[PDB]
Every structure is written in C-alpha cells, then in structure tokens.
Amino acid sequence: ITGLFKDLTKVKHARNGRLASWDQRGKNQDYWEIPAGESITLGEIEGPGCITHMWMTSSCRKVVAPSILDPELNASAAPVMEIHPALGVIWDAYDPFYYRKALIKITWDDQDTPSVLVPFGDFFCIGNSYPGNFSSLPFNVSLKPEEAGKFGAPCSVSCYFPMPFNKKAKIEIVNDNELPFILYFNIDYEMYGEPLPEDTAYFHAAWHRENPCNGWGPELQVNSPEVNNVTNFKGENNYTVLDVEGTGHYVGCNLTVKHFQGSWWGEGNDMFFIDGEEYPSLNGTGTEDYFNHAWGMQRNAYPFFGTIVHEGDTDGFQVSYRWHITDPVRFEKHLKVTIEHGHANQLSDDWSSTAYWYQILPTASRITIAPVEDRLPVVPQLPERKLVLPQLTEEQQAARDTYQKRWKDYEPRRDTQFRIKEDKARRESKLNTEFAKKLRDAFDAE
Amino acid sequence: EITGLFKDLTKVKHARNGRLASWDQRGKNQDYWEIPAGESITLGEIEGPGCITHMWMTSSCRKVVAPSILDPELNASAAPVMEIHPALGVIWDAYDPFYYRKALIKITWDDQDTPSVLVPFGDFFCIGNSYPGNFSSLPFNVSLKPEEAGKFGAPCSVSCYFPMPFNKKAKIEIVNDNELPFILYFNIDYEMYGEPLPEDTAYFHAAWHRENPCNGWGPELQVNSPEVNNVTNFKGENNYTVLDVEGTGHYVGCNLTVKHFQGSWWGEGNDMFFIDGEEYPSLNGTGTEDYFNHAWGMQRNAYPFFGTIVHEGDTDGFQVSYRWHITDPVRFEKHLKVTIEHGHANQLSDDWSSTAYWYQILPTASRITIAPVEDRLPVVPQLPERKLVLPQLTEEQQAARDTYQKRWKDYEPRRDTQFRIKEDKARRESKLNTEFAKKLRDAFDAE
Amino acid sequence: EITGLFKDLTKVKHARNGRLASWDQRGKNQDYWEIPAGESITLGEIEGPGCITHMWMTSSCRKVVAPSILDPELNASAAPVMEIHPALGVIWDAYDPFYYRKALIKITWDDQDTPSVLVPFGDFFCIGNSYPGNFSSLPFNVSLKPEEAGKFGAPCSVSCYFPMPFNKKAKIEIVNDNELPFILYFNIDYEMYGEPLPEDTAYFHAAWHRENPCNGWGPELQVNSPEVNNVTNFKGENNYTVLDVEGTGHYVGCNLTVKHFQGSWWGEGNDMFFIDGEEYPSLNGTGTEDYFNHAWGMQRNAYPFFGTIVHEGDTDGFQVSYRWHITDPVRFEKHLKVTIEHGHANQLSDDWSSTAYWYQILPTASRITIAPVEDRLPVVPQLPERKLVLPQLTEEQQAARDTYQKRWKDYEPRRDTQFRIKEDKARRESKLNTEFAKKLRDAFDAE
Amino acid sequence: ITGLFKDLTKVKHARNGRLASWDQRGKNQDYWEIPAGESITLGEIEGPGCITHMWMTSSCRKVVAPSILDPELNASAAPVMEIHPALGVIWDAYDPFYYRKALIKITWDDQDTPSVLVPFGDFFCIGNSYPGNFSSLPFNVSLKPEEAGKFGAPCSVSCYFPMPFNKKAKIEIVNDNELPFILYFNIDYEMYGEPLPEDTAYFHAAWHRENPCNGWGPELQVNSPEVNNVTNFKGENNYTVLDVEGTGHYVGCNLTVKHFQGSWWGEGNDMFFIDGEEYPSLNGTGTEDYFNHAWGMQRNAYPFFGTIVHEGDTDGFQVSYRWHITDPVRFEKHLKVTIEHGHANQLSDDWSSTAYWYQILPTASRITIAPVEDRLPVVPQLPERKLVLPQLTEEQQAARDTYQKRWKDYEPRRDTQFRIKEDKARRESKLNTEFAKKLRDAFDAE
Ligand SMILES: [Ca+2]
Ligand SMILES: [Ca+2]
Ligand SMILES: [Ca+2]
Ligand SMILES: [Ca+2]
C-alpha cells in the first residue's frame, strides 16, 4: 500500500494521551485562567512519545466599567462577555497585544534550554497580535469575520507538525501580561513501547525581531535606479530568520512586516548559508518570491505558503508564511537563514519572524527571546486630549459619583472571580502531569 | 532516499489498476445506473488482494409530478435529468428531498458475515441531513453548484480518497430503501496485488448513529446559564455515542449533523474517549466546536483535517461538521468508545447523527447495524393542512382540469416504463462489472 | 515509531541542498533573466544523484508600442515591468498575450537523447490557453492577482512540488519560440545524495498535445440529442489521446484546456485507459467532468487532487481543468494509453490541448515531441480589419503626428539596447549557474 | 425657477411641528412602550396642516429566561438587550409577528372612519412581518444585514407621502399583540395660516388578504397549456387591492405573496375598473409586469417599483411595491384595483396588500381590517417534540429547581418595568396632543 494515506492501513502499538484545559470539577469551565506575570505548565509527558496535534483558543478582556451583571453568577455563565459597550450593561475590553505578551515554551528530554520559545500568537501563525483566517498543511487559524481586523481577536489555532521526544516533553505558557488570560487547549500525543532512533530530529521554534532594521537608505524610494544598483553578495547585514548549530533541517517561517514608506518592503532576497560557508549557496530573488507569490503578496494561503494578513487590509503590515515540508533546507553543522531587508538591506522596516526546524539533540544553540517591551506591535496613537470638564450640574455630578461608587464595589468582585479561576489553572496544571504519569506507567505495565 | 509525502511517486509498483464504474456497457451515453426502488444493487465484487484507492459518485432522484409535452420515449435518451424550471409549464420532475438518507452504501470485506461499512449514501460522502454543502478536505470532497445549494437532495459530486485494503474480497452495494429509483454515476478505482497484504493490515470501516432526541436533563434551561454550567459529568455514561467498537485499530474521525432546537448553542459538550475498556475517559476534550478545531462557535471554514460542511447560520437550525484524525489517529488495542456530551453534561435534547470512520484488523467483531429508514429522515417543519374548497367552476375551467388529468393519466405510465428499462440495464451491468473484475484479476494472476 | 505524511520531518538525511535561481550575480536587484527571442537558454545543469524538490517561477512579456517620457537607460534599473496605465500618456509596454504558449520548459535527465519534459511554459505550470487562473492543489499552485486575472498573458506566480529524481544529470531549459524576449524569475530547489538512487527509480515526465479541431462526426448535432446519445463507442480508436507511452511507470494526472464551439456541453466524453497493450479499455469512465471529479458540468472549485483552473462561465467559451492521481496513480508494466472521448463517441470538433504527467524507469523509449509554435496559439475571435482614413489634417495635427513619430524613432532603439544588455546577462548567468552547481556537487562529494 | 427643487426657492409662512416619542422626563428613553391589547394616540393635531415626514423604529422582545442582569438597573440601560442567548446571561426572544399584530390608524377631520387602517409593518412596506432593506421615493427601510432574514427584525421606516388635513389629524397605534412593544417615532408636519382648498385630496391606505385565494386549479402546473387557454375578461374573481367610491387617485401598493406550488405565482394581470365600468379599461399583462420587472421579480428596488423581499431569499414568499406618483390611476366616482391571482385566478396562494390612494372627503365607507388571527404569516411548524426527562441526578434536579426559582423571581420584576414604561407612554400621549394644541394656538395668535 503506497502514498500519503498508507500508514492508516497498518496498526501501531502506541497509546494515545491528551493534555487538555478540561474542567477537572466535571463542570463547563473547560479552560484555564492563565495568571498575570506567571509561567504555567500545560503538562509534562514522559517519553518515548510524539505530539501529533495541538488545538487552542484564548481571550484576554480587561474590566474597564462596572456591570449590572451579577459578577459571582456571571463567573459560571459563558467565559467571555461578547456584549457591545453601547448596551450600557458591561464593558470587558479587548486586550490588543496579549498574543505577544504570552510565550509558548517547550523543553525536550530535561534539557537546560527550551527547544521552542515563541510568542503565543506567532507560534500559531498570528503575527503582530493580529489574527488572519487561513489554512495550510501544518498550521490553521479559524477566525470569525465578526472578530477579524482587530488586534487581539479570538480565533482557533491548530498545529499538526509532529514533535517526537524520547524522554520528556514539558509544555509551558509564560504570561508576561499584567492581565491574566483564558486558554483552551487540546494537546494530543502518542506514547511508544520502545525508544525512538537516537538520531530522531526534534521540533524547534524561535522568534526574532529587528525594529527598526538598520537600513542604509530608508528615505530613498524603493526600486529607484540608485537603490537597485547597490551590491550585496555576502549578506552580513541581512535580516536573520535563523542562526543555529547542529544537524537537522529548516521547515519554514512566518514573517510579520510593518512597512513605513508605503512602496514595497519585499525586494530583498532569501540567502541560505549551509555548514559555515562564507557566501550563501542558496540565493533567492525577492521576499514575495521566497513566499512563492509574485508582483507583491496576494490574498492566497496555500498548503506550503502565502498570506495570513494582507498589507491591503491593514495599516501597512503583512503576515506571511512558507513551509519547507517536502523541500526542507538541510544542514550537518550549521544553518543561517537570512533575507535582505529590502534590496541590499536598504530599508528600516519592523520585521519579526518565527523559524521552525527539526534537529538531533543536544540543542547546542541557547534560544533567547526579546523582552516583552520589544515584542509589542508598532501602532499610531492619538494625540493627548487633556479634556477640561464643563461646569457640572448637581445631577451630572451625582451621575459621575454614583457610577464611580458602582465601579469601586464591582471591580474587586471581578478580581475575586479571576483569582478563583487562576487557582483552578494551577491545580489542573499539576493534575494534568499526574494523570500523564499514571497513563505512562499503566501503558508500560501493559 | 527520496523523502516526504510525494516520495512513493518515485518508485514503481507491480500492481494492476481496475475500476468499477456505471459506464454504459451498450457503448452509448447512459454512463449511470437507475438504482431500483426498495432493492439492493452490487456496484461490484473484487477478489483480493487489492486496495480501493478512489471513489467518485454523483446522483439524482426526481419524482414525476405533472404531465410533460416532452415525448417520454425520446426524453429517455436525452440528458438523464430534466433541469427545467416548473414555471415553463412543459415538465415537472420534482427533487426527492431525503434520497441521501433513504439509500445506504454497504461494503463487506473478505466474505465476512457482517458489513464493515453500513452508512446512508449521503452521510458516507459527508452530506449530512440529506442537505449538501460545498467543501474540500484531504480524504473527502463535495463539489456543489451554487444554483443547487441550500436545498435538501441537491445534486453534487462526492469523492473519497481513504484507502480500503482487502486480502480476499471487496463487495460494494447500494441499499435503496426509497419508494423511488435514483440515478447513480460512480467510478471506484482500485489496484490488485501479486502477494497477500500483511496479516494485521487495517481494514476501512464506517458506521452511522442517531439520537433524536438526545435524552437531555435540561432542554428548556438556557445553555451556559450558571445552573447548567455547574452540573458535573465525569463518567459520560449518557454522552452521545459516535463509535463503540471491539477490535485492534484506530479511529480516523467523523461527520456530525446537529439540528439545534432552542436557538442558543448546541456545542458546549466535551469529546470524551474511552480506550481499552477504561471506566473514566483518558482523553478529555473541552467543547464540540473545540473537538472540530473551531472556537467561539463553528466558522464557515473547511480545512484539510476539520471544519464546517453546512453552517447553522445558512440553515433552519442545523450544522454539519467533520474532523479527520489522519496524522493524529485515536488507536486502541481492545476497545474504543468515542463520545461527545450532547450539550454540557448532556443538558440538550437536540437531533444528533454521525458517521464514524475507523481502521481495524479483521475480524469485524462488532455486528454493524443501521437504524431503519423511518429513523433516518431529517426533522423539517411542515405547512398546516390546506383542505382547499374549489370555487364554482366554469365549463372552460372544468374542461382544462379534465384535459390535464387525461394528459397525466396517459403520461405517468410512459415515464414509469422508461424507469423500468433503465433499472434492467443497472441489474445487467451489476453482473457485468463483477465478471470483468474477475477476468482482470485472473489475467493479472496468470501474467 | 512515527507515522503519517509528516513522518520524514522527524529523521535527518545526509543530503545537500542546491538551488538554480535567476539571482542577480552582480549582487544587484535584477534577480530575473531576460530570455532572448528565438533562443533556448539553460536554467542550469546539475550532476546527480539528486532530486528536484520545488520550483517557483514568475514571468513578464511586454511589447514596447509607444514612445515613453521615462529615460529608457535609467528605466532599465528601476522595477522590471512598467505597470503604468496607457491612459497616463507617459509609456506603453503592452501585454504579449500568448507568450506562455510561445515558450517551452524542457528537462533532460541523465543525458538521454530526448527530453523527458517538453511542455509549453504556461501549460506545464497549469496555465491553460495562455490565460492564468488563480488556484491551489497539492503539487501545483498559481497565485494570480484579481487586478491581472481574466486576460491572456496575465503575470502570476507558479509553483511545482512534484519530485524529480535523477541518478546522473538534470538539464533544465526554456525554449523561447517568441519573436519577443520575456522576463523569467525562478527558484529551482533540489537535494544531492551521497550514493546512487535505486536502479528502477521512476523519473518525472510531461508531454503536451492538442487536437484543434478534434475530428468529430457530428459537431453540428445538438449535444445530448437522442441521435448523438445512441451512437456506440467501445474501442475508442478516435478518442482524444492525453498520453500514449511505452515503459514501466504510472500516470499521475493532467491538465486539459477545452475551447467549446457550439455553446452546449463539451464534456459527455468518457475517460478510457488502455493498460499494457489491451485492445479494449480496462478502465472505463462515465464523462469528462466525472473524470475531473465534478458533476453536472464543471464547478468553480480547485481541490487538492482535481478541479477547475479557469471556468467556461468566466470566459469566451474555454475551460482549464486538472486532476492529480497521487494516491491513485494509473500504473503500467509495458504501455499506457490515456484517452477521453471528445464529446460522447467523439461527436465534437472542439479545440482540446493537454499536459500529461507520468513517472517511469529509464529509458524514455520514444522522443517527446511538440507541435510547432503556430499550432500552439489559443483560438480567439478577431475584429474586422478597420482600414482607417485620416481626415484632412491641420498643420498642428500634422506637426503632432510628426513630433510623435520622431520621438518613437529615437525611443524604440534605446529600449532595444536595454533588452540586449539583459539578454547578455541571462546567457552569462546560465553558464555561472551550471559552474556553481558543479562546484557544490564536487565539494559535497569531497566529504 | 423650474423643476422638482423649485419650491426650495420660495418662503412659505407655515409653522413646523413634530409628534415624537421624545422622553418628556428629559432623559434617554425617547421611545414609548406601547401596552398590549390597547390603542394609544401618537398625537392629535388641529388643522389646517400637512404631515411631511414620518420616521419610526420598533422592538418587541419576549422575556423567556431569567437574567443575571439586575432588571431594575437594566430598565435604564439601552432599551433592547442585543445579547446572544449562548452567553447564558439573558434571553429576550424576538416576537416574530408584532408588525402584523399592531395597526397604524389615522383619522382626518374627525370623520366617523379612519382613512388609514393598516398593519404597522405593511404600512411602512414591511410585508409578512419580515423586513427587507430597500429605498424608494416615498418609502424606505434601513435594515442591518445582521438582523435581516428573520420575522420581526428591527429596522428604520420612513414615509414621505404628504398627508394634508384642513381640520384634524389623529394618529394611533392599535396593539392587538398580547405583548407590549417599543416604538420610536418622529412625525413632522406644518400648520397653515388659512384653509387648504376644499377639493384637497387626503391620504388613504387600506389592507386586504385572501388566504387562500379561491383558485380553480391550484394542483395544475402553472403555464401548462390547459391553464394558459382558460379565459378571464371580466375579472369577477380577481384579487381585490382596492374597491372604493369617491373622487381621487390610486398611488400604488405593496403586495406580499406566499407561493405554495414552487413554480411561478405571478402570471395574473392587473385589471383596473374606473368609474363603475363592467369590463376593465386598463388591462395589464402579468404581476411582475405590473411591478415593472420581467421574467420573474428581480433583486432591484427602484424609485417607483420593485422587490422588498425576494422569493429567492425566503421560504416561498415575495414582497413587492409600485408607486404611481407621476402616473397615478385617477377616478371621478369609483376605482376597483384588481390582479388575477395566477392566470385567470388559477392559484390558491396567500396574497395580502396595502393600497394607497388620495381622495376628496368624505371617506364613503368605513375602512375595515381583518382581525389579528387572519393577519399572521403562514409558517411551517416543527412536529410536537413531547420530550421526556431522563432519570435525573440530585445535582441535575437541584440545577432545574435553582433555575425555576430564579425565573419565578425574575419574570415579575421585568413585568413591573414594562408597566412603568407603559405609564410613561400613556402620559406622553396626552402631553403630545396638549403641546400640539399650544403650538397651534400660539401660531394662530401670531
Ligand atoms: Ca531582489
Ligand atoms: Ca465543555
Ligand atoms: Ca459519457
Ligand atoms: Ca398574464
């Protein structure tokens, strides 16, 4: 039996397991309230095994007004109050940047360095904490049009990249937000009865940003003769997607670009440096070219490449992806994945990227992340208003004072309810790891 | 040395192609079968060892409801389906709404006592509620014209790429429990092998289930009220049951048709899997859209491994969804129960139906059953009885009524005869398909 | 152990990436080749053993038809294509409509005395009729901007993920039969191996065919008339031929461009596959949309293994369709003939052209040939000749005509010089590409 | 100065007035809760004057579940809780037929009959209690796409037909609904310093329904040769749009058709009988032909005719209109406006119509309306479900009891708030007429 479905025609003596946000009270809070300024373990899994599937969704609301909804009862209703502020009954505002303030962190085989350290959004192909609806073979986002075109929009994420581990999987959320946020997850794996071959390649992901890129000509018009006649062979100043020591293969990237001059951000060539070569052996032709579009980026999202968020729908930013699944970029010792930031590094745009690759352990490269203050989208902000109240009527002052009093009483009651859910999250964290161990030992006893 | 999902294209295989098709064995342009009312028909039997690689089908079921000025004998040899609007006054072949539920597809492997596939024709091909939706996924597709979409029994092209291996025999049948015949076009592609498949090859299985109503404890309570949300359900004994099967194998997903009655949300219930007879489920989900890898309700998205076929927002309160577990199958050594709470802790009493898909080693230990036809029809609202009283008729109106009734009495029997002729062709080509498959098998084995 | 279509990501391979690209080897921003008029150019030669894993290209072909106020020497170093509306009065680089048909892609493996791929540039990349459509499938994609869609020669991005293994040699050329040069951007990715591929590795092949007109017996009879439908065709001697090849391998699909003349339906014709010299087809289809896994005509769907690239409802009577047999290949030990009746029983006399894709062990037994350029052009209606007479001119109108003609006399030769320089760059970079691929092969093999 | 704008260039010594649902507490409830099973006077105006413009919108919710929103505070928030029932916090369901259960009733010069007596929806070109978004010269509906496609959808209605009156205008809502409903209105007029000419034509509107139409061949296929060769000259059995004695002109209609056989409802000809003639002097060709469409109805709404709700978008029903503003159908003694219900009255469909006309007083015969039971849309109904509860856990029974307890407490609290808002409507009804009288008398004193 041949072809991409053939393994369905053969049984495998492997045991399914799942880390999930399931309500371990048996009730309908099948999510975790991830605490502010804390890391939480979604679970630890003893290998040998393989992550086969991840699904998540999330919400981060800030309470900004008093509500006439009873906050104790409200805590047990639906998790997110999707109610328009115009109704005057509640105001749970959208937190715009929570997708960049939270990280997903994965450590294999009890290494002293993570193999995945990426902003929560970026890892699931939400760039700029601004989701786009799209499908590809390994990553998908299902975003409602009602929610689309907003920073911090709720959406469903799914990852089908396999993540093998011979000894240990530790999956954490690091929440650098001053706000807690709601996380639903289903993380599916299988456990094996024998070790994986020792040269099994493990899933890695890292995140980078150059903001600004150090361009030599950001004020020169893109594609002017002067710009286009500048030379760049060795790519020393190229944007660096990935720079890693070891044996394995690059499987692709997402790239978020905020373009400032309003011409074109994408004349820059991909250039790959394999096993320490001085000049790149793989030379590309342009950035949309690298993403397999042409004459700019199109509103297409195909199995191995395309657009997640189109520049034409936004205030000058693009989110793009390419997967190298059947055409990976292999290396024995070292790989540097670069892209010129504009032709010959002309431009000074805001570039950020997730690199995904597989490699044999140990992970020699110590993966780092920019601090939270360096991960936030660049957005224009309104000037200072400095409003001066008119002379208030006694009625108007009483309205203000009554409202303020409702706010003084209400906010603490919402705070109490967030603290109860955060206590559930920490409790279910250790329960998830305990159940995963029980399942491991029961499977091995066999 | 070649790697990745295209790699088997770079190596030759000493296997012989065959195809069961509705091709016109007169050599003419009726490349379809008129499946008779209330009969089973064998699409074909193939001797193993082999593997089904691809199925394509399309179908039509019209009821003659008015006389036509189209000569019915010549009309039989024109295009098979009269796509003519009734407002033209020249013909009326009405759409049969529920034919996708009235017909079953049935597949038996290795001359077993029980079928391994027994599913309504529509549901098997990811048509839920006998109501097609246009979509693509990796193993199943439906191609539905926008002019036909949004109605029960709409014509559309269905395709299945799930491989179906068989060491000894494949028998593919249509069980037509409809009072009406229907038109079936098919191409079923397969390859034949010169050596047996390995001993614990996993065989393709599919089974259909419905709970209508689900036995909810709180169907009149508002979904997501605090009272509903604080009820506990750990053990899932009253969960909706997608699949309950003894064997060694793996679940590869489902479609799920839900008609939701209260106008809130049907989908808070968790998927819960019970592997190898465990009392509590080892795999705990978070919600029904969550299981379908959507969030905050279902979206109008159809992706390679999950999504929406028919969105609730486009219908009279019903949703058709799917998930494929192709790279993330749910394995079992001895037993699998795939459940979903029907609303949080089985609160709701909606109309749930599902197709379950799985592979397992033979034998098929579980006798696969189907609900009878009267339990497979969509729940639809009906107009109040009319009981119209005729006005006083003129001579001219009574003569128009008489002339028309006379034309109808002459015309319906002439159409009936043309159905019966096409049914004879289907019964004949059924036998011819198997006989050719056998000749092809024997010639391959000789060579 | 790891299973499913992603499994090969979880093991390392000791294989070395390479890439043939139109990268500016001056290190500047002309990362494209100006392919000369009436010339062949080698994109590169690679020494095996290795495998092509990915191709991306885009292109542009404009005809300078008016003088420009843009400095033509400086213009050469700006963006490569002046996407400037003719109504502005400042430049006019007109679209060349048929350049996708006037150029070929030509691939030779292991220094054979025939190419294994010889297909028009467009059709190879699933641009039928020199008229792009936006679509995705598993092996081939076109990303076409809406602003460009719905015209002949529209620019678009093409990509190919079919693997192309080779033990000894890969030589990739463009044959430009156009009177005009064209711009080609390309990234051709491959890997090199440290030992030979198995002897019987199947190599990628592609051939192109056109029957214009098809030799129909009743082009003037209405499609699906009782007279047409009762004609028999078993043996399919007169069927449209997609592929006719001697060897050991498997067909993996096609694209099919049909221009239909009578305004009914072109697709009643059945696929008929003749395996290993059999006189009667063993694989019998039901219809042409049925082969493409649509039904009741073609839909505006493009799914992973089949569908519509350009829909007849969006054009002046032409359709471009595809089907991939990746999990369901049609295998042959000695010979394969892939045919489709051109209308039922070869009734119709439409314009049919096709790309066939197959893999086979070497040798390529027969030369792959192609119809000459005059036989590859789309069939388009033509305006009556408008023999304009000028009115009596004012001195001012004559001076404007004179001034314009003089600008044009000065301007055109300056653009010609700029094309000749870029053509010289393409010929220089052709040789550099091959030299670098040889250095990389040798350094890889050294360790 | 010529053309349709020419009157903007001449001053007129006329005084503006407006009847409105404005909050006469000075607060932000600028609507009336129209009580169930009651008539309420929007206002009475002393003539001479002319209505120039009407704007309304409305809402009718049924409380069907208990809410965690404090119901007393909720009464002073936004007037309509546009909150999805899936959130679990409130359930104010849409009342589907309120547009047909309430009438608009207008009486001129204290006549012993109204001159307008039409269901609230149909008057404002909402057919079948089912809004559709459209514009025309005298009537508009502005309907949000998120509300569209359902019975009882909220939308804004506007009327620009002038309504002159020499002595008196009385404008009422007759609410035959068992539920109250929210009405916002702005009714603009001018008052004049002298009588209008006594031959001034007054605005009339009347509603009719034939359900079923009394067809001779409802089971025969439409456009069958048998149907098409039946004759109808005199049109005795035609659907009647208008049948009135006096001197005036018909200015058009809306027509709601629910079609049963699934072919074409519209082969019937318009046939007008002017001044008592036995045979119609104006012979039409078909129903879509009368609506100035062809080959069925189109999704077009033009200044003088078209589609409000397209059969292609619904469960078998169409709403259409035609205005005869520049091409009115005049009569000296009598007008009968008829349409064959199918060719030669073949069909037995559900037809209802609003007829609009102007005439010199008196209104000869009382304008009557079918009672509420005869005004409801024909809708298919689900089979009786007859659910049986399973054996309940103690926890499930306590859940049901707690919810019932919340409901028993909550519903009467909402009832109380409806009753207070109804008192406001009745109070402002009287204040509207008193202020209109003070305005009349102040203008007249000037
Ligand atoms: Ca470049
Ligand atoms: Ca749940
Ligand atoms: Ca045929
Ligand atoms: Ca007529």
Residue numbers in the entry:
A (entry chain C), D (entry chain B): 4 to 449
B (entry chain F), C (entry chain A): 3 to 449
Give the published text.
Here, we identified the BBDE_2040 gene product from Bifidobacterium dentium (α-D-fructofuranosidase and difructose dianhydride I synthase/hydrolase from Bifidobacterium dentium [αFFase1]) as an enzyme with α-D-fructofuranosidase and α-D-arabinofuranosidase activities and an anomer-retaining manner. αFFase1 is not homologous with any known enzymes, suggesting that it is a member of a novel glycoside hydrolase family. αFFase1 did not catalyze any reactions when DFA III or inulin was used as a substrate, and there were no significant peak changes in the reaction of caramelized sugars other than those of the four peaks. These results indicate that αFFase1 specifically catalyzes the reversible hydrolysis of the intramolecular α-(2→1′)-D-fructofuranosidic bond of DFA I and DHL II. Because of the significant bias of equilibrium toward DFA synthesis, we propose a common name difructose dianhydride I synthase/hydrolase for this enzyme (EC 3.2.1.134). Each monomer consists of β-jelly roll 1 (residues 3–200, green), β-jelly roll 2 (201–396, magenta), and a 51-amino acid–long α-helix at the C terminus (397–448, blue), englobing the whole structure.
